[PDB]
Design a protein around this ligand. Structure first.
Ligand SMILES: [Mg+2]
Ligand SMILES: [Mg+2]
Ligand SMILES: [Mg+2]
Ligand SMILES: [Mg+2]
Ligand SMILES: [Mg+2]
Ligand SMILES: [Mg+2]
Ligand SMILES: [Mg+2]
Ligand SMILES: [Mg+2]
Ligand SMILES: [Mg+2]
Ligand SMILES: [Mg+2]
Ligand SMILES: [Mg+2]
Ligand SMILES: [Mg+2]
Ligand SMILES: [Mg+2]
Ligand SMILES: [Mg+2]
Ligand SMILES: [Mg+2]
Ligand SMILES: [Mg+2]
Ligand SMILES: [Mg+2]
Ligand SMILES: [Mg+2]
Ligand SMILES: [Mg+2]
Ligand SMILES: [Mg+2]
Ligand SMILES: [Mg+2]
Ligand SMILES: [Mg+2]
Ligand SMILES: [Mg+2]
Ligand SMILES: [Zn+2]
Lengths: 59, 116, 82, 182
RNA sequence: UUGCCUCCUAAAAUGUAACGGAGGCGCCCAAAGGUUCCCUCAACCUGGACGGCAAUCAGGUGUUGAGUGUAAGUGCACAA
RNA sequence: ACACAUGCUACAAUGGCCGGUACAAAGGGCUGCGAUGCCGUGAGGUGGAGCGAAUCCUUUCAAAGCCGGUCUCAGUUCGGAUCGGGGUCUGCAACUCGACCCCGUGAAGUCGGAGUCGCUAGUAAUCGCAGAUCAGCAACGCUGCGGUGAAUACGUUCCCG
């Protein structure tokens, strides 16, 4: 790990609107990331005809 | 801010800001911001994460926007292009579909003027 | 669009023809000069010869084609370019 | 006296999961993941040397280690390119940092993709290594929207000890990767 | 055309003519020199956001077909 | 694939959008004009008061205007073409080919080369209204009606008749 050349790697805590917390390493110097969507939030992770269109109108 | 995959502009009154979402325009803005209870006269600077949550929840709930909307409209055009309908033949040719006048104008369909 | 209050328009002529066709279960090619009747689910599998003014064009109705007037699938004027 | 979460979740669960599924003779033949390479091909660095300096800050912010610039090893006419012009940047991720990046990518970045319908399971090549592209660096959170000159794409590849595509697919599946089904 | 360099002619040492057959040179490099240490190509196959036969990334096959400042030969993967 | 010609809407801040408020003239009406009320978001639907009309309906009729708020010079809260969905009405029938409404979409366009046109006062410029034809309308046309309202004319050398 060549000494000076890298950006600093802080400890970090990730917080979400659904309450999920994460303790990770990050490049953010604050050390805290509040984020809206995650692996728990997202509708893809959670799983979320012309004749019918005809009979709806007239039937 | 960040909403439904979009990036809301720096300073706009919220009813104008929401219009950068591909499924929404000024009327749907005066609906959404009335239903959520968020003042339309706010900036994008004074928006909070909570307000963004209520917004995203509402407009994902009752409205189709952005990528799914585009996929769907494109899907309608290719739907009528496949069945060999008249409008489909028009979309193929690159001409006006609505029964308008093709003898002179229609340049917005045809594109820039190519001389003979 | 025709208003929903009136219901979709099919002339009694080919209404009767397609009924007689699908009650005997035979699928024939029906010769119709009516461009103006909308397509109904009753028509879904049949085949029509429709008038483009010069001739009759073969039209095989499918599911995707419901809710459309007949004439749309027989083009009128011929343009091959310059 | 420390631990990344994905390294942990791998060592405790996934290992046994695969050992029940594929019934390996030896505990060694269990596929683990070797390295994660991130690469941004520029290509307009042929015309403008300034863009590379944008790519550098991108990768270095996203990953957390300074990128390694690549020279063009051939000289090509049509792309307006000679030998020795810096074309593209590459970062190799191993051990801890590899794990932590994998986790930020799985848990955060990929859910933030615009119209994310998932990843294709078909991107494995013959050996069970997995490469997928990305269109815009805006997805990551250590990168600021405010400061971007222009959206730039990057390739992420996860190269694994897996022998085939079945094993690798199972490993990434177990690992929380969002694959479509076909 | 006339000096110098390489091949062939040239008859398995060396040498060998013709207005015989092919090419080059009248420089370049302050590193493209010295040394210590490390590495292996070209091509082909599969997979990757622009990106295509061919740019950069990953994996596989590959004993030498690449590459050697500059012609050609004799060499060089043990690496020149 | 094109070229010409007359028009309309524009390219924005003397402006756009929301709210409040003031002033016309002329016209049109029988199987026609159709009100209050009710249902719609809105085209409109239900309904029929009252009128062959200085009376009733077209609202007491306008819009630009005035007061206020917001937008802050940007391809934008400019521009509305195009295209998708969803409707209403006319009509035996809106596919080729009607108008209108609603949601979304949001292109060219930054005052326009050579040239060229109109206009001498209630004129130009700009703002709405009505009518004829007509079941419906391609009406931005045409014929009228009024609102607000300029600049300049030294002068006959030159172009046109
Ligand atoms: Mg492997
Ligand atoms: Mg010899
Ligand atoms: Mg010899
Ligand atoms: Mg000899
Ligand atoms: Mg001799
Ligand atoms: Mg010579
Ligand atoms: Mg050296
Ligand atoms: Mg390789
Ligand atoms: Mg002409
Ligand atoms: Mg006009
Ligand atoms: Mg106007
Ligand atoms: Mg306007
Ligand atoms: Mg507007
Ligand atoms: Mg007003
Ligand atoms: Mg008068
Ligand atoms: Mg109402
Ligand atoms: Mg009133
Ligand atoms: Mg606009
Ligand atoms: Mg433009
Ligand atoms: Mg401007
Ligand atoms: Mg000019
Ligand atoms: Mg006069
Ligand atoms: Mg009329
Ligand atoms: Zn979450």
């Amino acid at each position: 790990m060549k000494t000076g050349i890298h950006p600093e790697y802080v400890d970090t805590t990730v917080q979400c609107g659904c309450g999920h917390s994460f303790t990770t390493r990050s490049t953010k110097q604050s050390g805290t990331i509040v984020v809206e969507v995650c692996s728990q939030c997202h509708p893809f992770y959670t799983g979320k005809g012309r004749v019918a269109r005809f009979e709806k109108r007239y039937g | 801010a960040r909403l439904v995959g979009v990036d809301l502009p720096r300073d706009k009154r919220m009813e104008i800001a929401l219009t950068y979402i591909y499924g929404i325009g000024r009327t749907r803005s005066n609906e959404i911001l009335a239903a959520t209870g968020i003042d339309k006269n706010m900036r994008t600077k004074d928006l909070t994460d909570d307000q963004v949550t209520v917004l995203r929840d509402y407009i994902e709930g009752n409205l189709k926007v952005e990528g799914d909307l585009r996929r769907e409209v494109q899907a309608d055009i290719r739907r009528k292009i496949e069945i060999g309908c008249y409008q489909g033949l028009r979309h193929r040719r690159g001409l006006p579909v609505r029964g308008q006048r093709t003898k002179t104008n229609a340049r917005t369909r045809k594109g820039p003027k190519r001389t003979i | 669009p025709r208003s929903l209050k009136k219901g979709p328009f099919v002339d009694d002529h080919l209404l009767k023809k397609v009924d007689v066709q699908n009650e005997k279960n035979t699928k024939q090619v029906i010769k119709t000069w009516s461009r103006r009747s909308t397509i109904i689910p009753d028509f879904i599998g049949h085949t029509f010869a429709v008038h483009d003014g010069r001739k009759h064009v073969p039209v095989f109705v499918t599911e995707a084609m419901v809710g459309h007037k007949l004439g749309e699938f027989a083009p009128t004027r011929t343009f091959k370019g310059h | 006296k420390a631990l990344p979460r994905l390294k942990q979740r791998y060592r405790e669960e996934i290992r046994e999961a695969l050992q029940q599924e594929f019934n390996y003779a030896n505990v060694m033949q269990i596929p683990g993941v070797v390295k994660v390479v991130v690469n941004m091909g520029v290509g307009d660095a042929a015309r403008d040397a300034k863009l590379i300096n944008g790519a550098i800050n991108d990768l270095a912010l996203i990953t957390g280690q300074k990128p390694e610039v690549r020279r063009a090893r051939k000289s090509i006419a049509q792309f307006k390119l000679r030998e020795g012009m810096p074309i593209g940047a590459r970062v190799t991720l191993r051990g801890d940092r590899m794990w932590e990046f994998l986790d930020r990518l799985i848990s955060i970045a990929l859910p933030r993709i615009r119209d994310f319908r998932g990843l294709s399971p078909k991107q494995f090549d013959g050996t069970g290594n997995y490469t997928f592209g990305l269109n815009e660096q805006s997805m990551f959170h250590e990168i600021d929207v405010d400061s971007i000159d222009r959206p730039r794409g990057m390739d992420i590849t996860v190269v694994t000890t897996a022998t085939n595509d079945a094993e690798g697919r199972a490993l990434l599946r177990a690992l929380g990767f969002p694959f479509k089904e076909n």
